[PDB]
Design a protein around this ligand. Structure first.
Ligand code: 7YZ
Ligand code: 7YZ
Lengths: 306, 306
């Protein structure tokens, strides 16, 4: 037993991290087969950032302007292209450590592991959620751009995030691996703000099922509630609406604990209305929303990857 | 910016995990050079667990009783020995993925990353502390024994923990990699209990410095306090004593934030006496104690590993 904020094992991704240098800018890139993916603002200069036109910054570069380090080995760029907000640098060598992989664009509420990197070298791994406002609450310093977020499914790495920038509230914005920003953000140093965030209700319910699986039951109660009456309470406390689809997804957890989804909703209602009153759940004094139903089942039943 | 419960990149350790099977028992082992390390209770049978004498369970085994899987490859055991509570299986093949490594026995309060594994395959990674009562609050199911805890220092993996058993409060006990239990625990299924735990005070102070580095300052105040007067408050709230040595270790953080250690202690005092009163620190509504001063500096300045 026990319940931890668990990240996927990171080795498959560590083998893909490289350093990309252009001008005075160094960041991380992702080397899969013979292509290195990285944020396109690597081609920006210090004066170039209020309203850059990337289609030249790029038409003005030559391949030899791109310095790619794979550890103790320089990789030669033989071509470059831009796809939305990511650069793709064609190099003359295929990454022999290339895992089985997919690029996926995730929905808000979905979680993923982030391998934070500087100068092509991994620094740490942690677990994140895509917030409803399409930011992630990450841990990123200068040089971490191009670090990627990912999930692993048996043997396949599904990359879903690459890091680009930090917003004034200290939260983070980036793209999928095909270069499309999550949320309304753009890669230009102009006024931008996160927008109002909300709590991921289906994930909170999943984490309460995790708690029950692990022996915390103090928050359960008699009651039930309807979906409508639950969603009226959620909306006051700035929680995302719970859909019938969320309910079905919570089915396996409901069935394993014997607590109907709508009963767990009644418990969450009283937690929102009364608070926790000096008690904790799974070592937390807040309602945690960065575990999906799948994360809970994965961690509480022991799914592996190879 | 941002602050996350960060684990070390796990790839160097993933390359060392193997499956060990003996009789009806399957668990994980750690394959470094030509030796596989695993818990010695792998040689116990279902009837053998109330007071086993391992010196035979072992004298009765032959090498061919040990089934070791390195993925799709069976490893042949050519020798075995017991060191305290770990088995060492000499195999005929050296692990080519063997990193630079050390075995270290850590002090309570020190943190480490755990690569949770089942059947030799990694399941997830997370960050733990050795509690003052020498348990760890892990996430472990049947089959996770032999999963290891570790730190990374530039290029070197310092292994510090291997998992053995779960105590009735849902917390976990195990050994260093030379087989010595942390705490008073023994590998026999007889009555054992964790003992009273306490909060790791030096780590709480480090996490408050992390908060200041990251823009949470609401908890700072006028006051100062003496070490003695702080420790009188800590003892009432079941906190570990703060030593002058802890104070010196907190020096770099003190110097980077401009907040004297003893001033941060005055802040922690008021947090203990008044609570947080509906406010959070670094996304937590509790005082967090599983970041060391070194973790804070590592994450807030961007140290990497290669
Ligand atoms: C890349 O490694 C780096 C990572 C961040 C640095 C600190 N934490 C990070 O996650 N990214 C950056 O430094 C970007 C540079 C590019 C260059 C031009 C194209 C877009 C950004 N800069 C930022 O993240 C800055 N934030 C930012 O510009 O956000 C929008 C914005 C713009 C103007 C004015 C405001 Cl108030 C906000 C950071 C302030 C460094
Ligand atoms: C190995 O993969 C497994 C991992 C644990 C299973 C559930 N979570 C885990 O971390 N370890 C075990 O199953 C051990 C087996 C050995 C075999 C004999 C030598 C010592 C233990 N068993 C346990 O962890 C059990 N706990 C336990 O025995 O703790 C002390 C104890 C003993 C007697 C009575 C009490 Cl109340 C407590 C678990 C209960 C499975």
């Amino acid at each position: 037993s026990g319940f931890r904020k668990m990240a996927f094992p990171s080795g498959k991704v560590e083998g893909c991290m490289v350093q990309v240098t252009c001008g005075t800018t160094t960041l991380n890139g992702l080397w899969l087969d013979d292509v290195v993916y990285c944020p396109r603002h690597v081609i920006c200069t210090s004066e170039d950032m209020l309203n850059p036109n990337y289609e030249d910054l790029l038409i003005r570069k030559s391949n030899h302007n791109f310095l790619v380090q794979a550890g103790n080995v320089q990789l030669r760029v033989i071509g470059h292209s831009m796809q939305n907000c990511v650069l793709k640098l064609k190099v003359d060598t295929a990454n022999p450590k290339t895992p089985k992989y997919k690029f996926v664009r995730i929905q808000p509420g979905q979680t993923f592991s982030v391998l934070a990197c500087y100068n092509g070298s991994p620094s740490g791994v942690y677990q994140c959620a895509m917030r409803p406002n399409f930011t992630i609450k990450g841990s990123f310093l200068n040089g971490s751009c191009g670090s990627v977020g990912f999930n692993i499914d048996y043997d396949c790495v599904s990359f879903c995030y690459m890091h680009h920038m930090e917003l004034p509230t200290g939260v983070h914005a980036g793209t999928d691996l095909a270069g499309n920003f999550y949320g309304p953000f753009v890669d230009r140093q102009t006024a931008q703000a996160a927008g109002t965030d909300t709590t991921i209700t289906v994930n909170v319910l999943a984490w309460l099922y995790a708690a029950v699986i692990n022996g915390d039951r103090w928050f359960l109660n008699r009651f039930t509630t309807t979906l409508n009456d639950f969603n009226l309470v959620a909306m006051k406390y700035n929680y995302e609406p719970l859909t019938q689809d969320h309910v079905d997804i919570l089915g396996p957890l409901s069935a394993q604990t014997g607590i109907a989804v709508l009963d767990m909703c009644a418990s969450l209602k009283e937690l929102l209305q009364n608070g926790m009153n000096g008690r904790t759940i799974l070592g937390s004094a807040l309602l945690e929303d960065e575990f999906t139903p799948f994360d809970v089942v994965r961690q509480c039943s022991g799914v592996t990857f190879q």
